[PDB]
Amino acid sequence: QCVPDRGQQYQGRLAVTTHGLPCLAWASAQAKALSKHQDFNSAVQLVENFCRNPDGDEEGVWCYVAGKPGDFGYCDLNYCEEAVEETSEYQTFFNPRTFGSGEADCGLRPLFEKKSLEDKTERELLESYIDGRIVEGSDAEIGMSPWQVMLFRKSPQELLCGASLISDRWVLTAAHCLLYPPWDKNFTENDLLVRIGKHSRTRYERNIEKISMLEKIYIHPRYNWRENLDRDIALMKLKKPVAFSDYIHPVCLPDRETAASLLQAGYKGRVTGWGNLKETWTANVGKGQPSVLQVVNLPIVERPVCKDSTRIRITDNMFCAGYKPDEGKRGDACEGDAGGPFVMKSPFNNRWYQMGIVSWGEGCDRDGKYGFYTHVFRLKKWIQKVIDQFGE
Ligand SMILES: *[C@@H]1O[C@H](CO)[C@@H](O)[C@H](O)[C@H]1NC(C)=O
Numbered sequence: 001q002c003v004p005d006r007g008q009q010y011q012g013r014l015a016v017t018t019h020g021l022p023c024l025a026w027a028s029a030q031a032k033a034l035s036k037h038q039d040f041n042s043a044v045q046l047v048e049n050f051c052r053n054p055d056g057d058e059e060g061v062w063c064y065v066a067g068k069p070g071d072f073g074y075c076d077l078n079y080c081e082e083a084v085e086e087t088s089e090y091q092t093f094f095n096p097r098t099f100g101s102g103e104a105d106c107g108l109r110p111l112f113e114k115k116s117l118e119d120k121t122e123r124e125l126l127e128s129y130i131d132g133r134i135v136e137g138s139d140a141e142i143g144m145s146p147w148q149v150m151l152f153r154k155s156p157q158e159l160l161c162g163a164s165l166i167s168d169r170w171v172l173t174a175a176h177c178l179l180y181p182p183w184d185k186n187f188t189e190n191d192l193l194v195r196i197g198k199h200s201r202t203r204y205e206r207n208i209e210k211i212s213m214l215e216k217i218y219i220h221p222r223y224n225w226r227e228n229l230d231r232d233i234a235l236m237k238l239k240k241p242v243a244f245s246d247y248i249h250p251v252c253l254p255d256r257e258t259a260a261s262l263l264q265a266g267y268k269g270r271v272t273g274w275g276n277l278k279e280t281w282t283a284n285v286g287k288g289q290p291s292v293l294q295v296v297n298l299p300i301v302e303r304p305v306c307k308d309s310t311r312i313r314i315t316d317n318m319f320c321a322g323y324k325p326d327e328g329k330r331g332d333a334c335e336g337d338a339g340g341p342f343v344m345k346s347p348f349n350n351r352w353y354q355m356g357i358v359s360w361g362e363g364c365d366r367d368g369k370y371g372f373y374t375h376v377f378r379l380k381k382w383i384q385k386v387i388d389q390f391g392e
Contacts, residue, residue, distance in 0.1 A: 002078050002079060002080040003060075003077050003078050003079045003080060004080055006053060006056070006057070006058060006059075006060050006061075006079065006082070007051070007052070007053045007060040007061035007077060007079070008041075008043070008044055008052075008053045008056060010051070010052065010053070010061055010077065011045055011047065011050070013050070014050070014051060014075060014077070015048070015049045015050045015051055015063065015075070016051075016075065017063070017065060017073035017074060017075055017076075017221065018073070018074050018075060018076040018221060018222050018224075019073065019221065021065045021066070021073050022065065022066050023049045023050070023051060023063035023064070023065065023073070023075075024049060024063065024064040024065060024066060025048060025049035026046045026047075026048070026049060026052075026063075026064075027046075027048075028049070028064070030064070030069035030070075031064045034069055034070075035064065035069070035070060037388060038054075038055060038384075038385075038388065040054040040055060041054050041055065041056060049063060050063075051063050051074075051075035051077070055381050055384070055385070056381065057378075057381035057382060057385075058255075058256060058377060058378040058380065058381060059074060059222065059378045059379075059381070059382055060074060060075070060077060060079060061074070061075050061077060062074045062075060062221075063075065070388075070389035071389070072221070072385060073221050074221045074222045076222075081315075081316050082316055083303060083316050084256065084259060084260055084263065084316060084375065084377065085260075085263050085300075085302070085303055085319070086264075088108065088113075088349045088350050088351065089349050090103075090104060090105075090106070090107075090252070090349065090351065092104050093253070093255075093380060093384070094383065094384055094387055095387075097392055098387045098388065098390055098391070098392065099166075099167050099169065099170065099383075099387050100167040100168035100169030100170065100241055101167065101168050102166075102167045102168050102244060102249070102250040103167055103250065105249070105250075106166075106167075106249070106250040106251055106252040106253075106351065106352075107250075107251060107252040107345075107346070107349075107350075107351025107352040107353065108249070108350075108351060108352075109143065109144075109146060109249060109352070110143060110146060110244075110245070110246040110247075110249055111142065111143035111144075111146075111246050111247075112143070112144075113350055113351075119141055119144055120141060121135070121270075121295065121297055122345060124268070124297055125266070125267070125268045125269075125270065125297060125344070125345055126267070126347065127267060127268075128267045129267065129268070129299045129323075134323060134329075135297065136296075137271075137294055137295060137296030137297075137332065137335075138294065138295065138296075139292055139293075139294070139295075140199070140272060140292065140293040140294060140295040142199055142247070143246055143247050144272065144293070144295060145270075145272040145293070145295075145341070145343075146165070146197075146245075146246075146247060146248050146249035146250075146251075147164050147165040147166075147249065147250060147251035147341060147343075147352075147354070148162065148164075148165075148198075148272055148293060148340075148341065149162065149163035149164060149165050149171055149173075149194055149195075149196050150162060150163070150194060150195045150196075150198060150201075150274075150337075151163050151173060151177060151192060151194055151339070152192065152193050152194065152195060153187075153191060153192060154190070154191050154192060154193050155191075159201070159274075159276070160177050160187075160192075160280075160338070161173055161174060161177040161276060161337055161338035161339040161340065162273050162274065162276055162336065162337020162338060162339055162340025162341065162358070163194065163236075163337075163339050163340065163341075164251055164340070164341040164354050164357075165196060165242070165248070165249075165250050165251060166250050166251060166253065166354075167250050168238075168241040168242050168243075168244065168250070169237060169238050169241045170235065170236070170237055170238070170387075171194065171235075171236050171238065172233070172234075172235055172339075172354070172357065172376075172379075173234055173235075173236065173338075173339030173340075173357065174232040174233065174234065174338055174339030174357050174358060174359060174374070175219045175220060175223045175231070175232050175233050175234035175339075176225060176229055176232050176338075176339075176359070176360060177234070177338055177339045178192075178217060178219065178234055179219050179223070179225070179234070180225050181225070182225060187217075188217065189213075189214045189215065189216065189217055189236075192214055192217075192236075193211060193212065193213060193214070194211065194212050194214070194238075195209055195210070195211045195212075196209070196210050196211070196212065196242055196248055197209045197210050197245060197247040197248045198293075199247070199292060199293050200291060200292050200293075201274050201290075201291055201292070201293075202291055203291075208245075208247050209247075210242055210243070210248065212238050212239065212240050212242060213238065213239035213240060214236050214237065214238060214239060215236075215237045215238060215239045216236070216237050216390075217234065217235075217236045218234065218235045218236070218237075218386055219233075219234045220233040220234065220235065220379070220382065228312050228313070229359055229360055229361075230315060230317070230318075231317065231374070232339070232357060232359045232360075232374045233357060233374060233379065234339070235379075235383065235386065237390070251341065251343065251352055251353070251354045252346075252351050252352060252353045252354070253353065253354065253376060253377075253379070253380060253383075254344075254353045254354075254355065254376065254377050255377055255380050256377055258346070258353065258377070259353075259355065259375070259376070259377035261348070262344050262346060262353060262355065263300065265346075265347055265348070266300070266344050266347075267299060267300075268297045268298060268299045268300070268344075269297070269298050269299070269300060269321055269342050269343060269344050269355055269356065270295065270296070270297055270298070270342065270343045270344070270345075271295075271296050271298055271321075271335045271336040271340070271341075271342050271356075271358070271371075272293060272294065272295050272296075272336060272337075272340070272341065272343070273293070273294055273335065273336020273337035273340045273358075274290055274292075274293060274294060274336070274337055275288075275289055275290045275294060275336070276336065276337035276338050276340065277334045277335065277336060277337060277338045277340070277358055277360075277364075278334045278335065278336075280338060281334065281364075281365070283334070283365055294336065296332065296335060296336070298321040298322050298323075298332075298335070298342070298371070299321065299322070299323070300319065300320065300321050301320055301321070301322070301370065303319075303320075305320070306319070306320035306370060306372075309363060309369050309370055310362075310363045310369065310372075311362075312362075314372075316375070317374065317375045317378060318359070318372055318373065318374055318375065319355075319356065319372070319373050319374075319375055320370040320371070320372060320373070321342065321356070321370060321371050321373060322335075322370045322371050325368035325369065331368075331370070332371070333363065333364045333365070333366065333367065333368075333369055333370070333371055334361075334364040334365070334371065335358070335371050336358060337358060338358055338359075338360075339357055339358060340357075340358050341354045341356070341357070342354070342355055342356025342357070342358060342373050343355060343356070354376055355373075355375070355376055356373035356374060356375070356376065357373065357374040357376065358371070358373055358374075359372050359373060359374055361373075
């Protein structure tokens with residue numbers, strides 16, 4: 001009875017967004033003559049202005065909305081819980097001329113994979129957690145996460161969240177870092193700057209660390225703080241495309257095929273951060289505050305295990321990680337950076353894929369729960385449509 005196949009078969013009557021905005025017709029002026037550069041699918045009925053899924057977006061049905069031509073909105077329908085969980089090759093998804101360069105080389109670490117070398121913990125991501133010896137989190141080697149991005153509040157100069165470098169031009173982060181009115185947070189481009197290529201938070205890293213400006217900030221349409229922080233997802237373009245170094249390199253994106261196979265293959269994940277989430281919370285000086293980038297290998301534990309741990313509802317776009325709650329074996333809730341990356345290394349091509357964007361996940365100061373994360377595999381078609389909105 002619930003919506004299957006992600007709305008590709010839907011012909012019922014509903015033509016407005018999740019947030020309450022009017023759907024421009026598919027036969028309308030800008031939605032026709034101006035918007036068409038995609039190889040759409042001619043299997044879905046393109047009726048009037050009804051929400052449909054002609055590109056087969058893993059997020060579902062959508063429409064173009066009244067605004068600056070190109071803008072689009074998702075429509076709140078009753079989808080079925082499609083639990084994603086039960087050389088060195090790559091193919092480019094987005095067109096390099098708008099997503100920037102780096103895609104065709106993503107994941108491959110300058111100072112590791114490309115040097116035919118391993119990091120001190122990557123030969124640990126490939127085992128099922130062996131029990132007893134939990135190799136704790138700690139000081140990160142240099143160049144260990146070349147996608148690791150910091151998000152600074154311009155003035156009065158302040159660090160807000162972590163983030164991920166996907167290409168020379170684009171970065172992904174949690175949407176709550178920027179828009180969150182339970183906290184007043186209504187940040188815009190002008191208030192924010194990023195520092196890419198840093199390993200130490202405080203100290204200045206000469207020539208190494210670059211620092212850049214933001215151009216436009218896209219908060220993904222189906223974002224709702226109003227309940228549980230669903231779709232904690234925001235995308236920000238850079239004013240000035242960054243030059244890849246040995247300390248700067250983008251991270252690859254999984255789709256359903258790739259994310260699932262990673263999950264079926266993998267046993268763990270990596271949260272590189274600074275203690276940002278941990279610390280921001282005025283959970284405060286709960287002891288130290290790591291001066292240097294931090295790293296930890298976190299096992300994903302099965303959905304039924306995660307659902308039972310919290311009060312609230314895990315959506316198939318949110319996912320757990322970490323170790324067991326214990327009297328004398330304590331886990332690591334609220335880990336790394338807000339909107340920071342949680343990653344996995346594809347054994348199928350030795351590349352690194354970002355699987356998780358971190359969240360406030362109240363199972364945090366619960367003090368015996370799992371860290372909750374946001375899934376990344378659904379964004380690909382949305383991203384595609386967003387960058388197409390920009391142009392050369
Ligand atoms: C945030 O505040 C600015 C005030 O200049 C306003 O233009 C904008 O619409 C606000 N954004 C949201 C999402 O409320």
